[PDB]
UniProtKB/Swiss-Prot annotation, chain A:
Post-translational modifications: N-glycosylation promotes endocytosis and degradation through the proteasomal or lysosomal pathways.
Family according to the record: Belongs to the cation diffusion facilitator (CDF) transporter (TC 2.A.4) family. SLC30A subfamily.
Role summary: Zinc ion:proton antiporter that could function at the plasma membrane mediating zinc efflux from cells against its electrochemical gradient protecting them from intracellular zinc accumulation and toxicity. Alternatively, could prevent the transport to the plasma membrane of CACNB2, the L-type calcium channels regulatory subunit, through a yet to be defined mechanism. By modulating the expression of these channels at the plasma membrane, could prevent calcium and zinc influx into cells. By the same mechanism, could also prevent L-type calcium channels-mediated heavy metal influx into cells.
Expression triggers: Up-regulated by zinc (at protein level). Up-regulated in macrophages by LPS (at protein level).
Organism listed in the record: Homo sapiens
The encoding gene: SLC30A1
Protein name, entry field: Proton-coupled zinc antiporter SLC30A1
Subcellular localization, as worded in the UniProt entry: Cell membrane; Basolateral cell membrane; Cytoplasmic vesicle membrane; Cytoplasm
Length: 76, 74
């Protein structure tokens, strides 16, 4: 009975501020029953050493904005 | 306008060069008759992946799925 609010602006800004993230090329969100929100992102990263290190940070940022299921596609 | 042949899709993905493992192969039906897919993929190394990501995208396209997000494990 209670819609969940997604802060687009701070989500995208926090993602862009993750070390080694050069661009967010794609980001979609969609929502299911039980206010469960799913997201995809395509990101440009500096190099594959960054990405493996920083994927956890991205997942944490999503989680901090009430999105618990993500698929992150990097471009190097 | 194409069926998604599930068995061939999984089998083709698994046989893409440098793909070691395919997990979490999800197909989502969204509004406006949109189908997208997500997948977790274990690759040999990041040189393979950047080579293969086009191939995976095209395999998905071939099985009637036009938007994909592939999450690699190195």
């Amino acid at each position: 009975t209670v819609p969940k609010q997604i802060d687009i602006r701070n989500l995208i800004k926090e993602l862009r501020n993750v070390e080694g993230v050069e661009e967010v090329h794609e980001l979609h969100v969609w929502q299911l029953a039980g206010s469960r929100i799913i997201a995809t992102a395509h990101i440009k990263c500096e190099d594959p050493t960054s990405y493996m290190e920083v994927a956890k940070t991205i997942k944490d940022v999503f989680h901090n904005h009430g999105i618990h299921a993500t698929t992150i596609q990097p471009e190097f």
